[PDB]
Symmetry: D2
Subunit: 115 residues, 4 copies
């Protein structure tokens, strides 16, 4: 998978399961077009978001529906969602993992980009 | 100030200075309307974003221009910006401090809500 | 204050109040000597840890008692404490702000060094 | 592996490779006894730290030699190392992953505890 998303829960100390993940790509007219989506599994990942042929250079947005996740756990959250906006750049072979660590009033995100 | 933003640089160990901060508020037609903007000072904060009378209930987005910040420092970062989307003043007026900690391939955000 | 500590709670969206902070300084015999201690106030900071004259060059450890904090809130957390070990004043006197953001199964720490 | 350590680099956007990881267990006399150690691989993990028979309940310390890692990259770091101190508790089957995300002036750590 050229693009992987991993969601972790800082309160329970576990992968964040059943979280909706939406991916968008910026079109030529500067609007967000739905690209891929899924629900995280027991591993905190929504497996199989895209393919190497589809995941071309461009500007992408990964939206994680954190509010629904915290509401399901009964914890009052601050954010409506967590969004990660980045440019995908070909510079030799690349694999992107967008990882997010969630708390009710905070989130962290990092990118792990490997050859 | 009912809405404060503090931006920190995890590489240099300093406030992130001269960073552009843009705030939007969601309109009834579900579009994002410009609400306020500023530039961080030597303390990593843009002083005087809004007022008590203007900062009404709503869904707000704070966009911190991290890409321009890292580029000005000679680093090609991963993210286009650090975003923070939240509902404000839904249980009465509060003071919100949005803090962001920046690295070239990661960022964290947290909210401190007082009153 | 040459050494400031700010503790934030990522679950409640507030400063972490009544948290014990212990500071040690490494002695010539490679053992940790007690240096200062305090309790965070309503702003999440223990006011007046040390002075310019006492805060000499050395290797310091700031231990934040996160386990007692979470237990007092009814949470059984993962960590015993949040630690921060650093060399201070090696390139002349500086002001250090050690910030920690806490969750039951995670914590982050950052330093802001000024002067 | 009942105990796994994963180290990520927030500056390069990759696993932190060739990082020394030291694990200690608190003995009955309240001193830190070396338990296991290794160097992170290309995946950011020092594979095979312990076994299920050896990894009993107790207080453990995971020390990550961050300073040597940043010095090898030529970046001035703040911390002498990153330390994670926690209690291992049997409450049905458990597998512990200690993850750390590194920056020169900041580190984050989380625990992912699975059945
Ligand atoms: O020194 C102050 O006044 C001050 C204020 C707000 C602050 N927010 C942080 C913070 C944010 C994140 Cl997302 C992660 C971590 Cl470790 C720290 O540090 C602050 C310090
Ligand atoms: O054990 C694994 O496979 C695995 C993978 C990706 C991971 N990303 C993290 C992580 C992310 C953020 Cl944004 C902050 C922190 Cl403290 C940690 O931990 C991971 C563990």
């Amino acid at each position: 998978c050229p693009l992987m998303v991993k969601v972790l829960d800082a309160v329970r100390g576990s992968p964040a399961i059943n979280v909706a993940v939406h991916v968008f790509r910026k079109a030529a007219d500067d609007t967000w077009e739905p690209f891929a989506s899924g629900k995280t599994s027991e591993s905190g990942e929504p497996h199989g978001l895209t393919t190497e042929e589809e995941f071309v250079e461009g500007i992408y947005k990964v939206e994680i529906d954190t509010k629904s996740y915290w509401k399901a756990l009964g914890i009052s959250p601050f954010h409506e969602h967590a969004e990660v906006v980045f440019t995908a750049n070909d510079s030799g072979p690349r694999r992107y993992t967008i990882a997010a660590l969630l708390s009710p009033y905070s989130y962290s995100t990092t990118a792990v980009v490997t050859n």
